[PDB]
Amino acid sequence: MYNTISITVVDADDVGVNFVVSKVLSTLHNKGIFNGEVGVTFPRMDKNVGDIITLFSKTGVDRKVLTSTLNTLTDFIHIGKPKEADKVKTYRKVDTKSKGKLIRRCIKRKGVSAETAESLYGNYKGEKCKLPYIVVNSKSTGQRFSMFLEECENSEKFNSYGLCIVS
RNA sequence: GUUAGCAGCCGCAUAGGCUG
């Protein structure tokens, strides 16, 4: 049994559902909601994540704290009432590694030249993921990327985005 | 199906993982 609370995207025609989902997830991340005890799941995920973001936790989920955390997005969301669920679908984030990323790390670790690395990776294409994803702007790394979500076994350990990590 | 699919770290790894 997990305590769950649901965030439904609402009245978002001007910006799009995926935009609101992206800002909700990033705001929860930036404000420290995902402290390792809170997971995230997406009940209406089919090919994108859907229009509902559900937080789940063993400890209490507080509607007041959640609303104040998202107080710059309340016009685009409806925060539901606390519930509880038996089996929650859990997710992890799959990362793609470009050829340039791999070549640069090879140069650092193997101490080889650029053309040596290009030859060693000459038949590498790059990960092309089609899973549902949420666009994320990382401040510390200065990058925008597509956070691909893959259904996983519930490890009961979660990262700063509410996604399962190995324990 | 979002105009996005990135930058890094760990690792022998173009296995896997993690950071944001």
**Which residues, 6+ apart, have CB-to-CB distance to A167 below 8 Å?**
A155, A156, A157
Residue A3 CB lies within 7 Å of the nucleic strand B: no
Nucleotide nearest to A164 (CA to C1'): B18
Domains annotated on chain A, with CATH: 2-94 (3.30.70.2540)
A81 touches strand B (CB under 7 A): no
Q: Residue A132: which residues within 8 A CB-CB, separation 6 or more?
A: A42, A45, A46, A47, A48, A49, A148, A149
Q: Which residue is the nearest neighbor of B20, CA to C1'? A: A138
Answer positive or negative: Cα dihedral of A77, A81, A82, A84. negative
Q: Which bases of chain B come closer than 7 Å to a protein CB?
A: 1-14, 17-20
How far from chain centre, in Å, is Cα A12? 20
Which whole-number Å values give the CA distances from A64 to A77, A79, A81, in the listed order? 14, 10, 11
Experimental method: X-ray
Contact yes or no for A131/A150 (Cβ under 8 A): yes
